[PDB]
Design a protein around this ligand. Sequence first.
Ligand SMILES: Nc1nc2c(ncn2[C@@H]2O[C@H](COP(=O)(O)OP(=O)(O)OP(=O)(O)O)[C@@H](O)[C@H]2O)c(=O)[nH]1
Ligand SMILES: [Mg+2]
Length: 348
Amino acid sequence: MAKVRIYQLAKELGMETQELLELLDQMGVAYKSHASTLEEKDAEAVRELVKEQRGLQEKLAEEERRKSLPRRPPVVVIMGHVDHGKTTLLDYLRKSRIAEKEAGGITQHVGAFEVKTPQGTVVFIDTPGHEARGAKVADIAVIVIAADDGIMPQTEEAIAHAKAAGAKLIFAINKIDLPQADPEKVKRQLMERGFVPEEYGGDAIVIPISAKTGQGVQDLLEMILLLAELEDYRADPNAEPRGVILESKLDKQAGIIANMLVQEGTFRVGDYVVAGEAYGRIRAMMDADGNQRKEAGPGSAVQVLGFQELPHAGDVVEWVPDLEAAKEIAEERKEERKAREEEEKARR
Ligand SMILES: Nc1nc2c(ncn2[C@@H]2O[C@H](COP(=O)(O)OP(=O)(O)OP(=O)(O)O)[C@@H](O)[C@H]2O)c(=O)[nH]1
Ligand SMILES: [Mg+2]
């Protein structure tokens, strides 16, 4: 130092000889060999210019990986005709989820539950129902058909709903344990309706299963996760929090509560949110496993406390910066709802 030789400075910077010589050439600093001596002006300039380029590349790298978003579990709705085994399938799926013991894990109903597999986690919507807009909830819809019954128009219509809901269809032929079961009949029904099973070279997905047995139900999961990978579901935990109201109700010893599914961003306790005209602050959050949750990320379905009113199902839960923002946004929707219902006076 004062003055330093190039081979010494290179050892300081953990740098290769030719690397530093290349760099010096760029800078316009003349030398002879790496044995040559550097002026302190040049040396300090090198020390600094090395810092820039290094930090910059780490900056370029860090901002490159964040460009790639974390994945999210698939959200799955189960549908079908009455008696076709919908509920039993749902109920079974719960039972397979804790294969261990009580509890622990109060297993409270947050409007959805998660089935964790060695492949990955699947989010199943658990709530009514028959289904009788709103915001997109399920990525995947599972259309259940009894093998001993087959395709009713009810099933046909539950199919067209999921297509209007933008959900990828998965057909499950159920009750295959019955002697009067006819899975082939159902395939022909699906085909004549324009859904061609993969085995026949079409894009339709058909998994035979028994909600009674548990037979092939494992296959159904692997396929969901499979199609999930095909669709590559992902969400940004850092975006402005966005979610959807599954169900909202009243526990008299509690008061207004809401079951919410998180889609984008991360909700936290203390956040102000507005769902439709409903709003409030988040006092607490509780998951399917019962834990009191500080934060909720995409795929998380949680119990929410602190809404002022009961929010409508399927409404979008959206983060807001403060209480005054919640009021104004929620109120503005009320005015239009009110006044446009007086547009519903005449003549409609
Ligand atoms: N043999 C057989 N019976 C089943 C199977 N799955 C469901 N069931 C029977 O189907 C009957 C009613 O179907 P659920 O499982 O309750 O489905 P669900 O509640 O009727 O569905 P929705 O009426 O549309 O609400 C029950 O008696 C079940 O025992 C199955 O995989 N095999
Ligand atoms: Mg039922």
